[PDB]
């Protein structure tokens, strides 16, 4: 009969209480000869895991763990988890092949002490500039309104102002009311913010306020003259009555209610399908030239990467067995299914069909509750890797991802002039704490001033003191830390 290991795991409440009732894990046990005895936490995973650690009720490994860098460091320092770099080298050819094709991931996996403490989740949907993550807050425009008013798609920021004024005053939805909301967003971090447009003024902005210049120097975006010009542009929209009166107050629920009723002229989101719906009334606002005549897209620092989806505890007495079980998860067909679902179940719907001859997966069309729930019911998460080279060989790409990737490529990639973005480096505990403190102090301040400058005005007079305030919060130290890790990554990434 099979060898045994005890794993703690995290899963969706829609999935079975015993993970071994999943088809993926049933097949896996047949292939590996290993029976997993699961401790499956389906809610409050982090708290339940932390109580187990402080009690000394440790499993052999924690699967689908998602811990922070701070957590990994603490657990390593206390000897709760062990270094695994030697286990990779000796026992894990699938993971070694990934790290050989993509040595940047090895650098991301390695702590500054030189050890690896966890096994990552890697999901590439596009590579480099073409990554689906490169732009999060895409701008969308009402093409029905443009046609009705007989307007061309704007090419410049000044054209956009003229179009928004026509949306404001022209009653493009034809109901004789001034109900059109020309420009809307949900202010701050995330997919519904306006900061995408700042790059029209040069350099631009992202949720980290950090880009990497082609000179190799990290740049804080929110103290640049370019950023001030961006803010002054959004202020112009505000002064002209073009911004949603609730843009700084509303929540996602309110935003999508107004979106569902097609009240927006121009708005921001990840995918228009979640806001204005699956229709042709809205399309991508192309990249606009600013007053300079030039076009730019700032890259986010987003990446389909999580450092820890599995750690091995200090009580594990079967390291070779464990490493081999983990390595089976990094086989390409296994990684794809673990991430997204499986094939061949006669008792419920399937995310995939397997082509027997080619041994490759194709996404199936889904019905009923399956679009909403089937992935959560059938995926397993945990450590895995899907590389951009797998698409068309091992598996199809999800249709929605493919659609978004192609828009990114068509509209944005030509204007992403930065060779690099900022890498997801693993910092020391001391640096982690310093960076956390600085961000806790300055992040809300940056957004508060930005909002005030738009709703009240006065940026020209307040700009110099604002930059001084950022330095009081430690901006120069922040940047030196970021630059230090960037430079180290350049040395280690090959
Ligand atoms: Ca109207
Ligand atoms: Ca700067
Ligand atoms: Zn069994
Ligand atoms: Zn059990
Ligand atoms: Zn417990
Ligand atoms: Zn050591
Ligand atoms: Zn509605
Ligand atoms: Zn790749
Ligand atoms: Zn402080």
From Swiss-Prot:
Q: Which UniProt keywords apply?
A: Calcium, Cell membrane, Lipoprotein, Membrane, Metal-binding, Palmitate, Polysaccharide transport, Signal, Sugar transport, Transport
Q: Does the entry feature the keyword Metal-binding, yes or no?
A: yes
> What is known about its subunit structure?
The complex is composed of two ATP-binding proteins (MsmK), two transmembrane proteins (FusB and FusC) and a solute-binding protein (FusA).
Variant or mutagenesis effect after changing residue 340 to A:
Significant decrease in fructooligosaccharide (FOS) binding. Impaired growth on nystose
Q: What is its main location?
A: membrane
Q: Which domain of life is it from?
A: Bacteria
**Role according to the record:** Part of the ABC transporter complex FusABC-MsmK involved in short- and long-chain fructooligosaccharide (FOS) import. Required for the utilization of long-chain FOSs. Binds kestose, nystose, fructofuranosyl-nystose and inulin, but not sucrose. Has a preference for long-chain FOSs (tetrasaccharides and larger).
Result for mutant: residue 270 to A: Loss of fructooligosaccharide (FOS) binding. No growth on nystose
Name of this chain's protein: Fructooligosaccharide ABC transporter substrate-binding protein FusA
Establish whether keyword Nucleotidyltransferase is in the entry. no
- The UniProt annotation places substrate binding at 123, 191, 270, 274, 309, 340, 375, 379
Membrane topology classification: Lipid-anchor
Molecular function GO terms recorded:
metal ion binding
The listed outcome for residue 133 to A is: 2-fold decrease in fructooligosaccharide (FOS) binding compared to the wild-type. Impaired growth on nystose
Q: Report which gene this protein is encoded by.
A: fusA
């Amino acid at each position: 009969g099979p060898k045994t290991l005890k794993f703690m795991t995290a899963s969706s409440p829609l999935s079975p209480k015993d993970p071994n009732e999943k088809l993926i894990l049933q097949r896996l046990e047949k292939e590996t000869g290993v029976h997993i005895d699961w401790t499956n936490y389906q809610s409050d995973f982090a708290e339940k895991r932390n109580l187990d650690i402080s009690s000394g009720d440790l499993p052999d490994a924690i699967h689908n763990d998602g811990a922070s860098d701070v957590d990994l460091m603490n657990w390593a320092k206390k000897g709760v988890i062990i270094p695994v770099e030697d286990l990779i080298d000796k026992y894990m050819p699938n993971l070694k092949k990934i790290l050989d094709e993509k040595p940047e991931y090895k650098a991301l996996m390695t702590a500054p002490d030189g050890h690896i403490y966890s096994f990552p989740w890697i999901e590439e949907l596009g590579d480099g500039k073409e990554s689906i993550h490169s732009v999060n807050d895409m701008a969308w425009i009402n093409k029905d309104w443009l046609k009705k008013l007989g307007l061309e798609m704007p090419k410049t920021t000044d054209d956009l102002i003229k179009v928004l004024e026509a949306f404001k005053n022209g009653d493009p939805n034809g109901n004789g009311e001034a109900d059109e909301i020309p420009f809307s967003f949900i202010s701050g971090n995330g997919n519904e913010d306006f900061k995408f447009l700042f790059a029209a003024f040069g350099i631009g902005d992202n949720d980290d306020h950090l880009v990497v210049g082609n000179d190799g120097k990290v740049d804080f975006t929110a103290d640049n003259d370019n950023y001030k010009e961006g803010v002054k542009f959004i202020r112009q929209l505000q002064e002209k009555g073009l911004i949603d009166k609730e843009a700084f107050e509303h929540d996602w629920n309110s935003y999508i209610a107004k979106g569902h009723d097609q009240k927006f002229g121009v708005y921001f989101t990840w995918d228009k399908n979640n806001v204005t719906g699956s229709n042709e009334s809205y399309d991508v606002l192309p990249v606009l030239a600013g007053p300079s005549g030039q076009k730019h897209v700032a890259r986010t620092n987003g990446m389909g990467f999580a450092r820890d989806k599995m750690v091995i505890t200090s009580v594990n007495k079967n390291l070779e067995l464990t490493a081999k079980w983990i390595d089976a998860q990094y086989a390409p067909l296994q990684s794809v299914q673990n991430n997204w679902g499986t094939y061949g179940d006669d008792k419920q719907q399937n995310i995939f069909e397997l082509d027997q001859a080619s041994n490759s997966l194709k996404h199936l069309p889904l019905n009923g509750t399956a679009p909403a729930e089937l992935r959560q019911k059938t995926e397993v998460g945990g450590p895995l890797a899907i590389l951009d080279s797998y698409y068309g060989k091992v598996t199809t790409m999800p249709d929605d991802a493919k659609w978004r990737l192609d828009l990114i490529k068509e509209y944005y990639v030509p204007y992403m002039s930065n060779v690099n973005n900022y890498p997801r480096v693993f910092m020391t505990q001391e640096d982690l704490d310093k960076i956390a403190h600085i961000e806790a102090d300055m992040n809300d301040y940056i957004y508060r001033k930005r909002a005030e400058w738009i709703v009240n005005g006065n940026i020209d007079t307040e700009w110099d003191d604002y930059k001084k305030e950022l330095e009081k919060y430690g901006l120069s130290d922040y940047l030196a830390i970021k630059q230090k890790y960037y430079d180290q990554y350049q040395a280690n990434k090959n």
